[PDB]
């Protein structure tokens with residue numbers, strides 16, 4: 575961020591600060607299961623308050639409510655509560671993020687006020703889909719809530735969304751988490767140790783299958799696991815995949831991706847076996863399948879099996895650097911957690927013999943919390959897809975929109 579305004583050089587004395595953060599935290603049974611992303615923004619928030627900010631107004635999304643208000647399902651109210659304990663200051667929660675009531679609450683706050691707005695994605699204008707005039711009005715409203723803007727939302731920095739690129743204030747500064755994460759990746763990606771392995775799992779298949787093409791110019795090996803794998807296996811192996819995650823658009827480029835991996839000498843490791851489930855539920859009935867057997871109709875693959883874990887281990891053993899985004903099964907539910915635990919064991923072992931190991935994402939970092947490995951890998955990032963877009967070699971939109979020096 576040498577060329578961008580950052581918080582260390584932003585005068586906040588007597589100023590209202592409006593701050594985009596990534597508070598898209600994981601939830602199970604309605605409880606926050608990892609406060610990593612909240613804790614990670616505390617240094618920027620505290621700095622603002624300690625250097626005389628009149629207020630700090632925090633804004634984020636939670637999940638993918640697709641431009642409809644879903645307070646019953648995706649409210650940020652629980653985050654406000656958690657932020658209090660981590661900050662040592664109280665926080666006022668507002669039930670919207672724009673409009674006359676929100677504008678009034680933020681216009682002239684008591685000295686030192688911390689305010690958290692409701693989920694930005696309850697409005698279609700944040701993503702811009704789910705209207706140019708209402709997008710402008712949404713952005714205008716957000717801009718009234720502070721005098722200066724800070725973006726500390728590293729985990730969302732790949733998204734060219736209204737709160738991330740559309741705030742119109744004279745000073746738009748990168749926060750300290752933004753700086754910490756970008757600095758770590760800049761050093762780690764400049765001259766990676768080789769072989770350099772990417773591990774791509776998870777459930778955001780439509781988005782992340784589109785990142786593979788450019789990642790194939792940067793890495794020497796790739797594990798394609800979790801929900802990502804089934805689109806590949808259906809196309810390449812004619813495998814029956816049941817109700818497993820499948821991306822129609824990505825299927826159309828699978829053969830081209832494999833051709834490119836061959837051209838570039840990138841070894842691709844796909845799974846060969848699975849733990850199956852009869853529905854998407856923690857207490858589903860379960861089974862086993864191989865690529866050869868296929869997955870029965872009406873069943874979904876929610877973990878890899880033991881022969882897949884062996885092949886993943888072989889790739890980890892060859893690696894001198896690893897970037898991992900996306901668990902290799904539904905690790906939140908014990909029936910489907912074994913493959914991700916086994917891979918974590920291998921990645922921790924690799925670190926101990928000198929591998930540079932980077933795990934990132936809202937959910938994947940929660941694997942580190944669950945199995946107590948946060949200090950047993952080289953770097954745990956608050957960015958998942960944001961970190962993969964860095965690996966591709968891009969300038970992230972939320973960084974690009976910051977004020978130039």
Ligand SMILES: Nc1ncnc2c1ncn2[C@@H]1O[C@H](COP(=O)(O)OP(=O)(O)O)[C@@H](O)[C@H]1O
Pocket residue numbers: 775776777778799800801802819875876877899900901902903904905906934935936937938939957958959
């Ligand atoms: N085979 C699978 N089917 C469905 N979901 C899966 C599968 N494997 C992993 N997942 C899910 O992937 C999710 C995380 O993916 P994603 O959100 O892309 O990762 P991150 O949050 O680290 O960026 C987890 O909640 C996990 O349950």
Ligand SMILES: [Cl-]
Pocket residue numbers: 777778779780781782
């Ligand atoms: Cl997606």
Ligand SMILES: [Mg+2]
Pocket residue numbers: 935936937938958
């Ligand atoms: Mg996630």
